[PDB]
Amino acid sequence: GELVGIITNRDMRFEVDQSKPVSEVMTKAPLITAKEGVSAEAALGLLRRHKIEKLPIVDGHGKLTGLITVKDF
Amino acid sequence: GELVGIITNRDMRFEVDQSKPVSEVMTKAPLITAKEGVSAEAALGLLRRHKIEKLPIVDGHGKLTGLITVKDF
Numbered sequence A, B: 001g002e003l004v005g006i007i008t009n010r011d012m013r014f015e016v017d018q019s020k021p022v023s024e025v026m027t028k029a030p031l032i033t034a035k036e037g038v039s040a041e042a043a044l045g046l047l048r049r050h051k052i053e054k055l056p057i058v059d060g061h062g063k064l065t066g067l068i069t070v071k072d073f
């Protein structure tokens, strides 16, 4: 359950081989992540500062728990 | 005319004080740029290498000449 990467449209927009494994093209860890229970304003600040769109939210061990984005609102 | 930066949707997406100048909310030089007459596949390779949707095409002096984007490809 520990995070090892992330994949988005910018990571695979023009990739030719659809057989490419996730580990081959994913954005390698470490990444910009927050802890469980992180405040919404802190998440917005991280999103604006790092200009990443999908911010993962991690537990106190390294296993992913959630993802923060205002689009649900 | 010296290309000193670039401002895209992400920089200005969630800014509140819209009265701020561009230089305060722009990505400053040096940018990821290519020479005039750069090959299409070379430009695509650079775009995927930096995973950025804008590529300024500049003269050797650094004067802006053109704007390649990822959605054209």
Ligand SMILES: Nc1ncnc2c1ncn2[C@@H]1O[C@H](COP(=O)(O)OP(=O)(O)OP(=O)(O)O)[C@@H](O)[C@H]1O
Pocket (backbone or CB within 6 Å): A006, A007, A008, A009, A010, A011, A026, A027, A031, A032, A033, A051, A052, A053, A054, A055, A056, B051
């Ligand atoms: N939280 C993060 N920390 C670090 N890098 C990230 C994070 N989220 C995404 N990235 C990386 O940033 C790059 C762009 O991801 P982003 O989420 O901005 O793309 P997207 O949502 O698909 O955007 P677009 O609509 O422009 O395609 C990719 O290389 C991706 O792996």
Ligand SMILES: Nc1ncnc2c1ncn2[C@@H]1O[C@H](COP(=O)(O)OP(=O)(O)OP(=O)(O)O)[C@@H](O)[C@H]1O
Pocket (backbone or CB within 6 Å): A051, B006, B007, B008, B009, B010, B011, B026, B027, B031, B032, B033, B051, B052, B053, B054, B055, B056
């Ligand atoms: N040539 C470049 N070199 C370096 N950084 C750049 C370059 N062009 C744009 N940037 C910056 O890289 C970031 C991402 O660029 P990109 O063009 O993917 O964003 P965008 O098109 O506004 O994104 P979206 O479509 O997801 O809203 C922005 O902060 C932008 O200012």
Ligand SMILES: [Mg+2]
Pocket (backbone or CB within 6 Å): A053
């Ligand atoms: Mg996007």
Ligand SMILES: [Mg+2]
Pocket (backbone or CB within 6 Å): B009, B053
């Ligand atoms: Mg765009």
Ligand SMILES: [Mg+2]
Pocket (backbone or CB within 6 Å): B053
């Ligand atoms: Mg886009």
